[PDB]
Paper text:
Peptidyl-tRNA hydrolase (Pth) is involved in the processing of prematurely dissociated peptidyl-tRNAs from ribosome during protein biosynthesis into peptide and tRNA. Pth acts upon the ester link in peptidyl-tRNA between the peptide and the 2′ or 3′ OH group at the 3′ end of tRNA. Since Pth from Acinetobacter baumannii (AbPth) plays an essential role in the survival of bacteria, the inhibition of its function will lead to the death of Acinetobacter baumannii. The polypeptide chain of AbPth adopted an α/β fold with seven β-strands, β1 (Ser5 - Leu10), β2 (Lys41 - Asp43), β3 (Gly48 - Arg52), β4 (His58 - Leu64), β5 (Ala89 - Glu96), β6 (Val103 - Thr108) and β7 (His130 - Ile136) and six α-helices, α1 (Ala24 - Tyr36), α2 (Ser72 - Phe82), α3 (Leu116 - Ile125), α4 (Ser146 - Gly151), α5 (Asn156 - Gln179) and α6 (Pro181 - Asn188).
We report here the three-dimensional structures of unbound AbPth and two of its complexes with cytidine and uridine including binding studies using fluorescence spectroscopic and surface plasmon resonance studies. These structures revealed that cytidine and uridine bound to AbPth in the active site region and caused several conformational changes in the side chains of residues at the active site region in the protein resulting in the induced fits. However, in the structure of the complex with cytidine as a result of binding of cytidine to protein four water molecules, W1, W2, W3 and W4 were expelled from the structure. Furthermore, the binding of cytidine in the active site caused drastic conformational changes in the side chains of Asn70, Asp98 and Asn116. These side chains in the complex moved away, from their original positions which were observed in the unbound structure, for accommodating ligand molecule. The complete reversals of the side chains of Asn70 and Asp98 are noteworthy. After having introduced all these changes, cytidine molecule got well stabilized in the cleft with the help of atleast seven hydrogen bonds and 72 van der Waals contacts (distances upto 4.2 Å). The pyrimidine ring of cytidine molecule is seen well stacked with the side chain of Tyr68 which was found to adopt a conformation in the disallowed region with φ, ψ values of 74.9°, 148.3°. The minimum distance as measured between Gly113 Cα O atom on one side to Asp98 Oδ2 atom on the opposite side of the entrance gate increased from 4.9 Å to 7.7 Å and 7.6 Å to allow the entry of cytidine and uridine respectively into the active site. In the unbound AbPth, the distances between Asn70 Oδ1 and His22 Nε2 was 4.8 Å which changed to 8.7 Å on the binding to cytidine while upon binding to uridine it changed to 8.5 Å.
Residue numbers in the entry: 1 to 193
Write the structure that this text describes.
Amino acid sequence: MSNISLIVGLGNPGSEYAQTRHNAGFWFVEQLADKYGITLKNDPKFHGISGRGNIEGHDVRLLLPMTYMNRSGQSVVPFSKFYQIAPEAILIAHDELDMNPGVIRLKTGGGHGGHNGLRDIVPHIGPNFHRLRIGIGHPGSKERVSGHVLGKAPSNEQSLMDGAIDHALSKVKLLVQGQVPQAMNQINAYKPA
Ligand SMILES: Nc1ccn([C@@H]2O[C@H](CO)[C@@H](O)[C@H]2O)c(=O)n1
């Protein structure tokens, strides 16, 4: 059903990418894992870091692909296939250029929206998974995007994103319980200030 049983955080591996905007998904899932005491550990068979544990009475798996962003499907696809997790039971947290820092919205379905992590996943499991879109803002230049997503946000924008992520963590209860509509209402209403 639409109970969430896999939460994927997208990002790039390595200390040099850890604090970049493109790792917003990693930030969310890492903080989720700590909140619920879920151990994230190297999972070489699935080219990622993974964990499993109890979130609010529900058995949930967590996955961070260690493939680099544009190859995220090399982790997500075989992982979800092996555990027989339908896309409708997957939440993928990812950075979103089309929303401001501090804005966070749940979306079901649709395309990759230019996101090359999602672009590597949608072809294989289809579009029908859920996304936690973590706003990272857009750069000045339309050609500045690589420099933006692989760049570190200013303390100001970082605080907004951290606050939004903190809010989302408080609503994961609704997601694993399969009240996706309520989770959408309460997440998507978040104002940073
Ligand atoms: N070694 C690297 C470095 C960066 N990336 C980034 O992931 C983005 C997917 O939107 C790509 O657009 C890119 O910015 C990646 O996949 N692999």
